[PDB]
Scaffold this active site. Structure first.
Site, PDB file in Angstrom:
ATOM      1  N   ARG A   1      17.020   6.174  23.589  1.00  0.00           N
ATOM      2  CA  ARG A   1      17.287   6.222  22.158  1.00  0.00           C
ATOM      3  C   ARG A   1      18.783   6.432  21.883  1.00  0.00           C
ATOM      4  NH1 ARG A   1      13.058  10.999  21.261  1.00  0.00           N
ATOM      5  NH2 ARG A   1      14.471  11.642  22.985  1.00  0.00           N
TER       6      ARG A   1
ATOM      7  N   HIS B   1      18.340  16.132  29.347  1.00  0.00           N
ATOM      8  CA  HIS B   1      16.978  15.951  28.908  1.00  0.00           C
ATOM      9  C   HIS B   1      16.061  16.524  29.964  1.00  0.00           C
ATOM     10  CE1 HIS B   1      13.356  14.031  27.216  1.00  0.00           C
ATOM     11  NE2 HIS B   1      14.049  14.119  26.094  1.00  0.00           N
TER      12      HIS B   1
ATOM     13  N   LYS C   1      25.390  26.696  25.986  1.00  0.00           N
ATOM     14  CA  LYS C   1      24.511  25.537  26.070  1.00  0.00           C
ATOM     15  C   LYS C   1      24.900  24.585  24.947  1.00  0.00           C
ATOM     16  CE  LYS C   1      19.807  24.045  27.012  1.00  0.00           C
ATOM     17  NZ  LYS C   1      20.081  22.765  26.291  1.00  0.00           N
ATOM     18  N   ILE C   2      25.156  23.324  25.288  1.00  0.00           N
ATOM     19  CA  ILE C   2      25.629  22.343  24.323  1.00  0.00           C
ATOM     20  C   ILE C   2      24.428  21.502  23.904  1.00  0.00           C
ATOM     21  CG2 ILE C   2      27.316  20.576  23.789  1.00  0.00           C
ATOM     22  CD1 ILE C   2      28.458  23.279  24.440  1.00  0.00           C
ATOM     23  N   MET C   3      23.985  21.644  22.657  1.00  0.00           N
ATOM     24  CA  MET C   3      22.804  20.914  22.234  1.00  0.00           C
ATOM     25  C   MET C   3      23.130  19.430  22.135  1.00  0.00           C
ATOM     26  SD  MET C   3      20.627  23.255  21.936  1.00  0.00           S
ATOM     27  CE  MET C   3      19.341  22.501  20.915  1.00  0.00           C
TER      28      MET C   3
ATOM     29  N   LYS D   1       0.804  -1.174   0.000  1.00  0.00           N
ATOM     30  CA  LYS D   1       0.000   0.000   0.000  1.00  0.00           C
ATOM     31  C   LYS D   1       0.862   1.259   0.000  1.00  0.00           C
ATOM     32  CE  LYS D   1      -3.389   2.435   2.745  1.00  0.00           C
ATOM     33  NZ  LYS D   1      -4.114   2.527   4.002  1.00  0.00           N
TER      34      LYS D   1
ATOM     35  N   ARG E   1      -8.374  23.727  28.153  1.00  0.00           N
ATOM     36  CA  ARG E   1      -8.680  24.996  27.447  1.00  0.00           C
ATOM     37  C   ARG E   1      -8.071  26.085  28.322  1.00  0.00           C
ATOM     38  NH1 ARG E   1     -14.155  25.592  23.800  1.00  0.00           N
ATOM     39  NH2 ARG E   1     -15.115  23.533  24.044  1.00  0.00           N
TER      40      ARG E   1
ATOM     41  N   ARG F   1       7.987  11.310  12.609  1.00  0.00           N
ATOM     42  CA  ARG F   1       7.046  11.702  13.653  1.00  0.00           C
ATOM     43  C   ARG F   1       5.630  11.905  13.120  1.00  0.00           C
ATOM     44  NH1 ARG F   1       8.034  13.999  18.645  1.00  0.00           N
ATOM     45  NH2 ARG F   1       9.626  12.311  18.658  1.00  0.00           N
TER      46      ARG F   1
ATOM     47  N   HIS G   1      12.424  23.265  19.855  1.00  0.00           N
ATOM     48  CA  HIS G   1      11.776  21.955  19.672  1.00  0.00           C
ATOM     49  C   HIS G   1      12.512  21.145  18.614  1.00  0.00           C
ATOM     50  CE1 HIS G   1       9.110  18.772  19.607  1.00  0.00           C
ATOM     51  NE2 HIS G   1       8.125  19.285  18.933  1.00  0.00           N
TER      52      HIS G   1
ATOM     53  N   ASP H   1      19.436  13.230  20.024  1.00  0.00           N
ATOM     54  CA  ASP H   1      19.912  14.109  18.944  1.00  0.00           C
ATOM     55  C   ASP H   1      21.426  14.050  18.706  1.00  0.00           C
ATOM     56  OD1 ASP H   1      17.288  14.829  18.595  1.00  0.00           O
ATOM     57  OD2 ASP H   1      17.403  16.346  20.087  1.00  0.00           O
TER      58      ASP H   1
HETATM   59 CL   LIG Z   1      -3.267   5.863   1.488  1.00  0.00          CL
END
Ligand SMILES: [Cl-]
Lengths: 370, 360
Positions: free
Chosen positions: A265, A256, A250-252, A67, A351, A332, A217, A307
């Site tokens: 991961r 965490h 700041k070290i990316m 598919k 809300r 994602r 992000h 990362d």
């Molecule tokens: Cl589809």
């Protein structure tokens, strides 16, 4: 600063898709340890698990592969649109625009179609990315089909125009599994807020892509790449990192907000990046990454997150740095669309209200009295 | 309490809707939309020199790049018009990027000036086979929109009511689309992404489209007597009446009182004998029977219909107005930001061993 700023720790909704940082396996997808899935499955099994609810049997998996393989080509109108997006565009805006345009061409007319639309996005996003990239950067219109059976291999065949090695197909599958889902982060939350108004699946994804484009992000593996590529020996990387730490840079790629002792991961992708480094004959980039990793532990007691070693892994597969976050979108999208289906089935969401900090009521002043 | 805002208050004592302290009713009576956009984006009402300069600036930002026109030509005639707005914002972000937040107000101005042409260039190309000039002789956004939509000079009354409408919908505190724009802004994403996301949430029928649903109600009826008779039937079945009530306003939506009077003037100018009378009968019946007032969406349906606006362009018009509030909310989020990341309650299965393919 408000006590409830960022909604940290406030329940915004319910999910059965994943748990992060809980006892036992640090990350699970419908109860399965992500490290087990990344070792033993292809990404299609994990997308099927998230979107359809269970790991597929061999005949379900073959049917799903078939598919998706029939959904890789792009409509002519969409190709024509991607040809008009400039070469210097942010690649995440290319992904955002491709999703937006595809929603006008292949609309989700009923939520009955929602899993067909999610499958279409998973199949077409590698071509949206690479058709634009190779058109603008190489002046070539590419075939959006390939002979590779998996999404991960198909992406490499479109990017490089040749059959990928079996190791490279494996690590792409591993990466797409590792990033597939991560509970209620900013982009999944954006997709669910949009889903709560009963908007269509393309809107939810286009919104999520926009949130993932922000540097708080998305893009951490691109930042890690821009750090590790600076150094021509692991000892130069160590000496320069010690100076950066004194400046409180700041070290990316390190630490965490949820994981307490390690990011599950990281161990997975670190191991695969080492195998790639050996296969391609690298003598510097992996050693540089290891030295930064060791120095970050000795000086700051920070572990590498998912990362960090993704940067070197993608680089060894020939992937341009600005296509790293777009690869994250291809992964994602599985979690995002699965979260939208949950929101639609059980449309409960927080809300939030605002605290007014503006001026008191004031009489209107006419234009010439100003 | 997600965040803080200085832009607006809703349902507080005194004026029920304010924009930076000003009663929306006084703004809509006396200002053009550009003065309210300036108030939201720049912080204060502009003076004559500032307003004249802002109008000249926005008048030079109305045209669309050729690549964008070519993209709009590929969006099908039957596309959802909100997807046209979403796509136009997305594509414009690749042509004229926000490369620093220093550009933020310039980008907001560009979206306010270009949105009318994104909507009408697509609409007239696909529905009337014409490629239109995206500039007009109208000094205001509200007049410009009508000039592009119809290809003729709009009457002074229509230009006024467009300006009133854009002001009335410009901002409404926190809601689904404003929240979406702020969540996106909280990751330090660019302005085009925050607006693209907000449009997507407004496309959902639980948030956007209420004035279109009001149109679909009032257009049914050939007379006010028939409308009253059918409404009392619907009320007995406890049908929800589109365009009535509010989750916040207690006795009146301040925007309703303004637009109702402008709808009544439009009905006179166009020689309507049925639509306004039907709307007023439903209004009167809802108050008598249920003590429910009309909200902003109810008389907007007739006002836009009298101006010759296709119903499916009503939410796109709201995008042209609410872009002012959305972008102003993004500026507030950027100036005082924390990434918005809420928690989930886990309702899924307990951890379980991996099952290999052949044992499934
Ligand atoms: Cl589809």
């Amino acid at each position: 600063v408000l006590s409830g700023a960022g909604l940290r720790g406030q329940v915004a909704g319910q999910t059965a898709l994943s748990t992060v940082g809980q006892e036992g396996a640090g990350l699970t997808y419908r109860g399965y340890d992500v490290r087990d899935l990344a070792a033993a499955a292809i990404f299609e099994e994990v997308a099927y698990l998230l979107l359809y609810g269970e790991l597929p049997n061999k005949q379900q998996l073959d049917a799903y592969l078939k598919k998706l393989q029939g959904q890789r080509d792009l409509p002519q109108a969409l190709k024509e649109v991607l040809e008009r997006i400039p070469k210097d565009a942010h690649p995440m805006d290319v992904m955002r625009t491709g999703a937006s345009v595809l929603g006008t061409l292949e609309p989700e007319l009923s939520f009955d179609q929602q899993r067909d639309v999610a499958d279409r996005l998973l199949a077409a996003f590698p071509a949206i990315m690479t058709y634009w990239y190779r058109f603008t950067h190489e002046g070539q219109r590419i075939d959006c089909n390939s002979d590779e059976p998996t999404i991960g291999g198909h992406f490499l065949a479109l990017l490089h125009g040749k059959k990928p090695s079996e190791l490279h197909v494996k690590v792409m599958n591993v990466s797409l599994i590792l990033y597939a889902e991560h509970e209620f982060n900013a982009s999944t939350f954006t997709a669910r807020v949009c889903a709560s108004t009963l908007s269509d699946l393309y809107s939810c994804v286009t919104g999520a892509i926009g949130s993932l484009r922000g540097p708080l992000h998305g893009g951490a593996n691109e930042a890690a790449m821009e750090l590790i590529e600076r150094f021509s020996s692991p000892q130069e990387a160590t000496a320069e990192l010690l100076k950066m730490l004194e400046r409180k840079d700041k070290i990316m790629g390190f630490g965490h907000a949820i994981y307490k002792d390690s990011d599950p991961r990281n161990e997975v992708i670190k191991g695969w990046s080492k195998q790639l480094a050996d296969e391609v004959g690298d003598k510097v980039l992996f050693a540089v990454s290891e030295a930064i990793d060791k120095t970050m532990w000795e000086q700051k007691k920070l572990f590498p997150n998912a990362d960090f070693y993704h940067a070197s892994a993608y680089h060894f597969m020939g992937i341009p740095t600005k296509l790293f976050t777009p690869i994250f979108v291809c992964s994602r999208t599985s979690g995002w669309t699965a979260h939208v289906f949950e929101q639609r089935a059980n449309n409960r969401i927080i809300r939030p209200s605002a605290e007014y900090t503006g001026v008191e009521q004031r009489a209107f002043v006419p234009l010439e009295q100003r």
